[model samples]
Target: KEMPQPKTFGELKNLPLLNTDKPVQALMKIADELGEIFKFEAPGRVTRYLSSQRLIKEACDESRFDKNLSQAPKFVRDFAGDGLFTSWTHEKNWKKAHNILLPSFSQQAMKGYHAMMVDIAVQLVQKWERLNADEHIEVPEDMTRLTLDTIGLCGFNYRFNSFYRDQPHPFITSMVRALDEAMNKLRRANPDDPAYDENKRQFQEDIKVMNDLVDKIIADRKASGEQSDDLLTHMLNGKDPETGEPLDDENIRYQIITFLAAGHEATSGLLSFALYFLVKNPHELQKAAEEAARVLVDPVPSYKQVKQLKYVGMVLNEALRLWPTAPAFSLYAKEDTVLGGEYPLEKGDELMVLIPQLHRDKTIWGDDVEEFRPERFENPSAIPQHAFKPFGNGQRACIGQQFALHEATLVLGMMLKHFDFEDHTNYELDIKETLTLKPEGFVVKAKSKKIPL
Candidate 1:
């Protein structure tokens, strides 16, 4: 009898195709080894990894029938709680939540949060100013604090004071611990092991620490009977058109936590990588600074003016292209479908899109895919739509895309105008992949500009 068709490239029936010892290496290697469309079995789950731009684009298109949401894996759902980011929800529920939260990230809504974000960024600048120019600063850690503080303020009008304290804020500590525990849960080979119980307990406890804190804020806001234009207020006031009912405090809390948790890491990752590329390519840094000096008359530019800082946007686009924070995400197949006009995807199939791989595809991005060139975005029309989606694509794409872009552009522009940055020639990227990509121990030295804009 013919052998059962190999479900994936790396046959797991007898041999382990994945190198559990070095996961990142294995992921990168698998794409090269298997080409674009291939399958692999790991941890008892078989998944198809799609790196081809055409196939990935087809999967991202919501118009193509009812594409099943890949949803968060069990490990991810457990960590994300019952929040919007969690995987245990229906498509209708996701759409409902998305619609409710969409307005909060609009251009006008983003303006309301600008001053708050600027204030938080200023605190970071002040911290850097206090230190000598040559002092080695951990890029990721600093950006994490800045982004956390910014999210706390803008997401719910809460203040983390991450930059003010010598120690990290309680919320930040809990969030980090929770994320670590969740990732551990995801990678745990044996779920029945008793050792996992403690991790689960800690995860629950840490999430409670986060939830209770948010509860107190929401409670205090309610007690005041004062209405404001922050995300929390909008969420509390937002109604489900189908039900004609407001979101309960608990649901609101979930949304707030989702915003804080999701926004915090991705923004921080982008800023860290943007700075990394800038320092590595000093001429780009000089060009960015010069552009900032020319366009920005004020330290904190207005939203429209921030939009006009073309070079700043290009630098960010390049950074995102090279290192997308939430690199790979999956979408499930609800019904039998054909992908890339050839590959047959049966219902219940798991399709994983490696975004970094897609972004670096030589065919789509041309030969210099590995180079750090911001000029690629200078003429975006040259690049095909859905080909460069660091923030994802389709209806479920990041609702906060505009919000994130504005925040990044403003911060980078403002910081460039105020300081010059440097990194050691021997420096290399030290990355840690949790729920999102994180830069670890990457250092950048900075010097305040002798003359301010």
Candidate 2:
């Protein structure tokens, strides 16, 4: 018989499971070996990893996990500046920001952004059409460009013209560098390290490029006095009902950064993984293609038509289930709290929700949890509440969940309408975790399934 694993932090560290190329796989293995919950230390903090769906749901039920147990790790917050993206912000501040930005991601708001998304997606498809039929395309890289352009327009009414540019836009380059630096700093966060200053300097410089660009856009909008239906217009022109004050430029910049980072990365990453899984499983690809051919008779799908693409949504949800873009999130105990009526947690103690494990929990998802199956989401209600939380659970659930769904469904349908992808056998999902879980080696060869215009 195999020896049982310890539940405490001390013994957990002694195991040879700390570093691995396949972090998600390692984490899932640890969960399987260690049971539902276990504690471990990282970067000078004791983090309790919670893997049980029921227990996680109970912990996040507001009555218990109302506030962040502590501020987000310092290195993580360095990239966001004074933004609402970091964990350091109070719940009140988050609520205020959430309320102000909520309408920007509503169904109605998504409808307004639909045409722009389709336009950008169509451009991407056209670019791919020019590619040699036998050539392999890095799906993630192309998808990233498509999404960056989409968010540039939808989130701020600015245009990166990402597909048109031969070189990546400075904003894209800098944003990527900033995230890379932040991730490195987070790994070895000590200030005494000589490389820390250089990385921090580079990160700040990259942030400045983004900030300056946004500042220019805001200033130009004010000077032009021109109005558009984009979210930026709302942010600049809208006011808080309670305070009767408009958001100053700094806060507006932070929100813009939040949207740019969280908005595009998640959807693009989902599209990347979704395409990979579909190509690998030809039957699912055929199903999605058939659905696309059926529903997307119109060049651009109507909002109603997009909603009817049920299989497409299922595929996307299944991909997110397997590889959530924002995999693990932490919540701090606001007061002395007992988790799931067993685990004791102090006010300052932090709980990390292992999303990947939760999604693949054998107890919740049964034996074939590791397999790629979209049918699990065919009857959404069959999966218990809080069990399938790609967006997250409770008050902190994604504000743009509906928006992302609409956007992703539209793009997936449109891509399927015009292109058929074949998997590169050498391509296994090399998931690289920086700010999000991204597929690094996922490549696919596409042939035109070009629809008659």
Candidate 3:
């Protein structure tokens, strides 16, 4: 029993990338010819992909592999800078901020965020209501606005007021561009090229744009001289229980930026894909609308009622399963260990879980892995191999995930209750990646769907 290695990455330069299908998508294609575990050589390191449930199960074993940032996530580190999402497992802030902020996302914390969530959701509904009857809704753009505004207000009570404007806030646009540069760094052949320098300059500029805004957010919070139970306050005063050290001012900014960036990307993708699927497949939309109508009888639903919208939850799960926005993450050895009981991996050789492929592993699910079927998740445990992890792996899982689930479920229901979405172009899902995923160039038109049967 040994790990497999591919001869050549095929029409792809190990160091210099060509115009290829996005890296994750290309790797998934490569896994089709290869077997359970495939190792290839990238520019500076060994690129390994684990595509089976058993393989991931082995890699996740604490005695063997643990969380490390080596690949695309390293790019996240450049801008996010040791924020909770981008910090390596070994990074002290990763553990410190994590321990300090973990309670901020608790059940009580979600209760605090819920009303703020409805405020942004209502903003989105209001904006859609004002759209011209034939004005096609820019689905991707609006989804970003909705999530950005939600996190802004909920995380620190900052106001993006994205709905009030025609475009997203400048901070959001720059943050996205910086993220794009992060992913593009993996593909660039010539670091010395003039364009590369220009791009790098822009990347730095974008980081400043994000940094300045977050810095101002922190400064404004302190300037208010009034403290509350938001993330800003928590980070400002939160001390690591073990060490009694709070996050420094800079660390606090990174946490806020991370929360805003990681906070919105996947949730936006979930909303975008969920809407595309609902419109692309009418029956699912009908189910969601009916569920929304059935449960969200009032203009605003309390968090309790949002949980009752089970069918809508399933649709979101299915979307994540089919197209995980945060598609892959890397893990490294805790100690020198033979992986999967056969393949030998040194202590630091990075292994990536190509989540998009693992989720589609036919052996785990069925032949219909590509089909959008929400009912499959109607009971999660019944599915074998623990194949569902749109949120990422356990223990090292996405920290703000429950917050995301709540926000997505709430927004999805609200949209369904008040609007009927139509895909005028009969658009197919075309994923656009910038560290995370979204359906690129996707559009849908919304007409008012007045509630109350």
Candidate 4:
């Protein structure tokens, strides 16, 4: 009943009712809480506490949850077919999940991903150049397609051919509707006594079509015994130690789905927000471009050069701080539990960690909570873990985090090096809050940077 801030993630780990996660409401509550923090058992017992790097590592070592599997909802179960795929991974042993999945993110493999992304960005930039010379170009939507195409290539070895298309692909369109329905149910759900059966039905059907398609691809590969350098090949070849087996078709499909949905979603948001920041802050843009010029002087950036763009990371961090994709994290409660010494949670309860409030918390981020200053991250010592969480912390933290960073850094570097955000700093950006936050009708004008070859 009271909006007092609680001190620990443990205290807020389990609350009977979910705190409203709307940014304005959460921010209002946070303002009242002031120097306090509240803990609630958000979502389920899975993410009971505030996540931290240390806790995440510890959870990875000691827990038995398989993130790929456990994180899936019942809707995904109905739609994707018998094996349950990545969600099934969540129900398995965590250590095994970590051991098996961690290596897939190997430095070499990620570099391959980076290389693919660079090419994708180049193709996108060329398109931008055409629009830049002619008229006001909407950047975010185009970037969204670019990343989607990249995900299709790097994650599934599928050529989505998303660019140069006038309409959404069947798979992409179906995926959007299915995901929308699933998220809607979560917001107004009676878990046990479900109401929206039709939406669930359609969502599942959509998932099945995609899963079946991926299954055929996997089968085709097995028949030919041809190894692909793409991520799908990597996952199919790697064996899970606890079970001593390669991921089956269902497992493979979910992993692919996860990357396609999650990987591209985050990168698109990151790229969009990064551009928003650059467009708004011309000085930072100048600084970022100078750094990019030093490395990408020839326009074809190499792996080593992409890695050295540290300021680019800071810009990304600041942008993410302002506009995180998910905006919050949540989990349903499994049993009755006490939260934050006052808030009570019962079995079948739902909880959410309000990230937008956390991101703009005045106490943690200082007085200039609204400013887009990348300098705070320039010296790593300027910020603390609890203070900033563009990517959530702890065991369930996004595993593909490094991959996301590499992708963002390189893409932003290329764009900054090539285009000047025309009408920079005056554009109003609007946010559409889906499961992932997105820019709604926000457009930017870009002119090719006067970088001479």
The per-prediction CA RMSD against the true structure, in angstroms, equals 3.1, 3.0, 2.2, 5.8
Candidate 3 CA-lDDT value? 0.82
Candidate 3 lands at a TM-score of 0.94
The local lDDT score (0 to 100) that residue 413 gets in candidate 4 is: 88
Q: Which stretches of model 3 miss by more than 4 angstroms?
A: 2-21
Clashes of each: 0, 2, 0, 33
Query: Can you write out model 1's per-residue Cα lDDT over 242-352, one digit (the tens) per residue?
Result: 656666787778777777777788988898889888888988998999998998887557777787899999999999888888877777776788877677777877777
Q: What are the per-residue Cα lDDT tens digits for candidate 3 across 14-90?
A: 44332454667777777887878887775556768889888887876766777878666678788789888888777
Ordering by lDDT: 3, 2, 1, 4
lDDT per model vs. reference: 0.75, 0.76, 0.82, 0.64
Better of 1 and 3 by TM-score: 3
* Candidate 2 positional error at 72, Å: 7.3
- Judging by TM-score, tell me the better candidate of 2 and 3: 3
What lDDT score is found at residue 54 in candidate 1? 79
Where does candidate 1 stray beyond 4 Å? 1-25, 65-73, 87-92, 241-243, 450-453
Using TM-score as the measure, the top candidate is 3
